[PDB]
Amino acid sequence: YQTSNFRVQPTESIVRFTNLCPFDEVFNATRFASVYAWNRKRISNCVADYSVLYNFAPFFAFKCYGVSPTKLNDLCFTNVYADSFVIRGNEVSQIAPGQTGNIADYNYKLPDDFTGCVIAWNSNKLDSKVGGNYNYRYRLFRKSNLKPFERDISTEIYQAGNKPCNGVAGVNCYFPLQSYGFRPTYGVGHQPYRVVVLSFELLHAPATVCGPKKSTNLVKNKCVNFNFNGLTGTGVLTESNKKFLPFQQFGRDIADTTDAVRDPQTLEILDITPCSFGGVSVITPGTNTSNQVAVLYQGVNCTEVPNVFQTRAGCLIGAEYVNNSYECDIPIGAGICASYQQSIIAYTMSLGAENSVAYSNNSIAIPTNFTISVTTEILPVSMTKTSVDCTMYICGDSTECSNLL
Amino acid sequence: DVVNHNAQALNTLVKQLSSKFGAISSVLNDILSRLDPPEAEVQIDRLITGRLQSLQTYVTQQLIRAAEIRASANLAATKMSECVLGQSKRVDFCGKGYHLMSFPQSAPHGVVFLHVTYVPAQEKNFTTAPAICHDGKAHFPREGVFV
Amino acid sequence: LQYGSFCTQLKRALTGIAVEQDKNTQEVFAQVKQIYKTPPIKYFGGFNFSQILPDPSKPSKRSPIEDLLFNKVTDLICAQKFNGLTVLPPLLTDEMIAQYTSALLAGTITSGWTFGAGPALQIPFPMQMAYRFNGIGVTQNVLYENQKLIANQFNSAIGKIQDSLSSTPSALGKLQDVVNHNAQALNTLVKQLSSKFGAISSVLNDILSRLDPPEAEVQIDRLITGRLQSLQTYVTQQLIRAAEIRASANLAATKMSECVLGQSKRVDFCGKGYHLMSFPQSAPHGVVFLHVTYVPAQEKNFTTAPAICHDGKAHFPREGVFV
Amino acid sequence: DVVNHNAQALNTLVKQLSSKFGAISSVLNDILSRLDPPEAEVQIDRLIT
Amino acid sequence: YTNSFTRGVYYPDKVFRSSVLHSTQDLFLPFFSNVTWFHAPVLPFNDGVYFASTEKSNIIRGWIFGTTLDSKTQSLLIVNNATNVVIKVCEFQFCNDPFLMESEFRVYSSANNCTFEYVSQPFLMKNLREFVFKNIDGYFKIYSKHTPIDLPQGFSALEPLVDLPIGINITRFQTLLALHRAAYYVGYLQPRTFLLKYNENGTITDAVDCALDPLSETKCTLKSFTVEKGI
Ligand SMILES: *[C@@H]1O[C@H](CO)[C@@H](O)[C@H](O)[C@H]1NC(C)=O
Ligand SMILES: *[C@@H]1O[C@H](CO)[C@@H](O)[C@H](O)[C@H]1NC(C)=O
Ligand SMILES: *[C@@H]1O[C@H](CO)[C@@H](O)[C@H](O)[C@H]1NC(C)=O
Ligand SMILES: *[C@@H]1O[C@H](CO)[C@@H](O)[C@H](O)[C@H]1NC(C)=O
Ligand SMILES: *[C@@H]1O[C@H](CO)[C@@H](O)[C@H](O)[C@H]1NC(C)=O
Ligand SMILES: *[C@@H]1O[C@H](CO)[C@@H](O)[C@H](O)[C@H]1NC(C)=O
């Protein structure tokens, strides 16, 4: 009988991965650009911690979509972007992937498949002028919808009617760029907020921006968890003779499974192989006859398991091989059978008794008597006839789900 | 084996009703009470899809098994026509040996054939020849063999 | 765990198929009680069987034709192994099957059709061939008076078979198609693991290490559903294909019983023409029959009559025809 | 019936295209218009399945 | 005018593969294409550019990529001075016919803030120099290859050289040598689906277009380079 599987377990952990990466100058910026013209800064080639910037705690809303905020320090990213501006708290809901909004459609479009985090903190005291700060201005109208991740600077006169103006403005011609009403009297939602979004990628390029983790020494020939630059996995790590070209980092078989990797610290190539595993079968005579058993580890070398006999089917434990030959009793495989004789034995099955016929040029054999024999033969002819009520089975007695059905 | 297979299939179908299929509960009334009508629909639809899938697999397996049973029944009808209503010359079709006759018996969901055959025994050695030369002519046996 | 008992049903279906495969081979080859051996001196009245009898020199103990067949019919395995797919060895090895076929050949050469109904009774081979000539409606003296010509024709016809197989490479298409179909199904199964099915990624580790559990669960569900669908489809196709192979194996067993262990009167069951005898050979995952038949030739025209009138009485031919 | 069993089967196939399958509508264009791109995806996935 | 037989093939990704047929979709130079054998005027930059040349003594130096090539709009410049690769991206005002002991060197009309000034080992140096330039995803990617030997009829893939995260818009480009009107070809890229053969090592021995002709489409569908008789 086939019962379960056996799997080797890892015994260790291997990790592989410098200058600090500054965010304070990005966050603690003296001035922030307008919504219609939003500042963008590229972050790369520097290791950064997301907890130090989580220590200031000015935030009012943290929204990470692709990732979870708690695991941010654990992930290695490439091509980090930071888009920054100032907007009052009224329009914070308008910034989300696939979210309808006036600035979303006309000032800054966020793709619905966004991968990153959006945060905003209220620096009302610093960014709200008591006499009115009209420097921050947003576009109100344009002929067409804005594309995702596009910045528009050209602010021409917008024609709002049949009346052709051409710099005349007036009725049916309003200039899109318009300034906020920055009153300290204005309450929550009309006070300034410094909003920055952080955009990342996952696994299209070799890692550049890694988090705050510490590397360890590497091991070989042992099944061990490994975390090469954020590439998690488990297996035995071996030396590799693959002819990796200097731009090449991983390898892959016909099944698109990673077959090699390069250490971030030492430039060398390593092969990967999952540790051994397989199926387990239990060979037993009847329970009433005895309680001894034998165990078969299918397709496994006997050297890789914690009487031991090696067979083309696997490793057999608990049975003693013999040189005799009988008819098959319990088939193990590859011509090997097993039987019970106050012990459990394994042997090579025998095809039958051997016989040689006395062929000759002029010899014949004739019967001198006969036998009448009777034999049985059993054949099934029919099956059970069943029927089912579809609705009663699926839905039972609820009429709500019947309509759904 | 036929009875065991059918009973196993029916039992599996019945037991599949108590699986939640990734919903909060398997009991319909619990979803009806614990939730508002607008929300209940998704949870209900999960159960609908799961139970419909299980029914489909049951029916497909039954079709395959029925085709196997039909093949067996056609073989049985051929044996009835050729071993019982006649005498066969096909080797090993009706028992082992030289076929003489057969007798049918009925059994639950099937049939049993009793084949009556002839078997030689107690052989002996002899010297043989293909033909006999006599009076300058070659003689061949009409139906037997020279010993 | 709370998605049903589908895993148990899939495992049980595959086990049933695997057991049926060994039963198929047992039905075809294990049709003989004893292991018969050929006499040391290989003289059978001028007929030469060297091309189908076992070759002592080769270590495999296979006949030349069987060697040609085995050579004719022919890492991706590691990738399949590393994802929970395994291939089990068959119960009967190739040597056992070759030994079974050699036993059948020895029995039919030295005993005629007798060993298939009781004890094996010996008879000279030309005398057996005269019995088989009587079987199709020709008298014995036709064989005994043309023994050398018939033996030469048989030897030449056997000689041409090896070339006919060796030259044409499309002869063994059926056996190759079985292997290709199986390998294609396994390859599709293993390649299906790289589909997103609507999730953010197709790697479980990334989804786990990137999201909180409440948001990871919804992503896990999609992958589970897609992969379960793939497994179900694979098992259904295997069930249908096994249902086909079983019919083929039943036909092969019937042909072994009726063409090799006896002489058949069914038209076109054992070759084209009037059946005389047949010989089996083993091939990877299959069997090959060689059918020996009688074909008339060089006909002539005659005038005939239904009866002959003599002394006011009508005479009819006892077993022939008037010409 | 060998003819009939085929001509029937195709018919049911071509009728399943008019079934909503638990979506708002069975017409792709009608769903594409009346709904936002983020929302349309679940409806389309229902139809596809 | 002349014909590009089988040229413009490069490695699409930085991963190892061996003894495998792999199918990709990417910008490529379609097989047996019309390419312009300039023997000397702005040249458009549509989706990418395939440049090839056989000149010796480094007559050609670099290229100029820009949307409008004005001091108001950012542009690009690359110079190979037999010592290092001077890449720059600053708003320049260009001469009408720019070019380069000639102790004095030409100066462009104006300069502005230089956003990126990567410098490295020079590119250049009977032989052919092939370069593929593409600008997508806010990245400017450059491939290259130098082969000893007229475009020869053979196969030689191009290895990636550099990627620049400049993230600007380019529409037009020109070359940097004395253009008082030196032989160099120009071709263009289009979206295509290719089938590439990787040998035992990482090299790309052969490839196949998927839309050249019906036979190629059959080779794609069967995923092999040979087809038996059939339909
Ligand atoms: C594995 O099994 C083979 C025989 O199948 C044996 O020769 C070998 O020593 C075993 N161990 C290793 C590490 O190969
Ligand atoms: C049968 O006859 C042949 C030729 O006459 C001879 O070679 C062979 O040995 C004979 N068989 C015996 C004597 O068993
Ligand atoms: C016929 O003779 C042979 C010669 O050895 C002998 O082996 C065989 O047993 C004999 N047959 C019978 C039925 O005794
Ligand atoms: C028999 O005669 C017919 C007509 O004379 C002729 O066509 C046919 O070929 C003849 N048969 C043979 C075998 O010669
Ligand atoms: C390439 O294009 C030019 C102009 O369009 C044309 O004259 C020439 O024949 C073309 N080359 C071909 C078709 O090989
Ligand atoms: C591939 O690398 C091996 C390494 O020894 C070499 O022998 C072989 O010639 C190479 N094949 C090429 C470069 O085509």
UniProtKB/Swiss-Prot annotation, chain A:
Subunit structure: Binds to host ACE2. RBD also interacts with the N-linked glycan on 'Asn-90' of ACE2. Cleavage of S generates a polybasic C-terminal sequence on S1 that binds to host Neuropilin-1 (NRP1) and Neuropilin-2 (NRP2) receptors. Interacts with host integrin alpha-5/beta-1 (ITGA5:ITGB1) and with ACE2 in complex with integrin alpha-5/beta-1 (ITGA5:ITGB1). May interact via cytoplasmic c-terminus with M protein. May interact (via N-terminus) with host bilirubin and biliverdin, thereby preventing antibody binding to the SARS-CoV-2 spike NTD via an allosteric mechanism.
Name of the protein described by the UniProt record: Spike protein S1
Impact noted for substituting residue 353 to V: In strain: Beta/B.1.351, Iota/B.1.526
Known glycosylation sites: 11, 13, 28, 288, 301, 323, 361, 369
Impact reported for residue 28 to Q: Reduced viral infectivity
Result of changing residue 178 to R: In strain: Omicron/BA.1, Omicron/BA.2, Omicron/BA.2.12.1
Gene: S
Chain intervals for the UniProt region annotation (Receptor-binding domain (RBD)): 7-226
Phenotype for residue 131 to S: In strain: Omicron/BA.1, Omicron/BA.2.75, Omicron/XBB.1.5, Omicron/EG.5.1
Range covered out of full length: 313 to 753 of 1273
Protein species of origin: Severe acute respiratory syndrome coronavirus 2
Phenotype upon changing residue 175 to L: Increased resistance to neutralizing antibodies and human covalescent sera neutralization
Source taxon at top rank: Viruses
Impact noted for substituting residue 368 to I: In strain: Alpha/B.1.1.7
Documented effect of changing residue 129 to T: In strain: Omicron/BQ.1.1
Annotated effect of mutating residue 138 to F: In strain: B.1.1.298
Domain BetaCoV S1-CTD: 19-212
Positions of the UniProt region annotated as Immunodominant HLA epitope recognized by the CD8+: 133-141
Curated annotation (Swiss-Prot), chain C:
Intrachain disulfide bonds: 259-270
Glycan attachment residues as annotated in the record: 48, 301
Listed result of changing residue 298 to H: In strain: Kappa/B.1.617.1
Coiled coil: 176-220
Impact upon substituting residue 254 to I: In strain: Gamma/P.1
Effect annotated for changing residue 177 to N: In strain: Delta/B.1.617.2, Mu/B.1.621
Region (Heptad repeat 1): 147-197
Outcome reported for the amino acid change (mutating residue 83 to K): In strain: Omicron/BA.1
Official protein name in the record: Spike protein S2
Shown residues within the full chain: 754 to 1096 of 1273
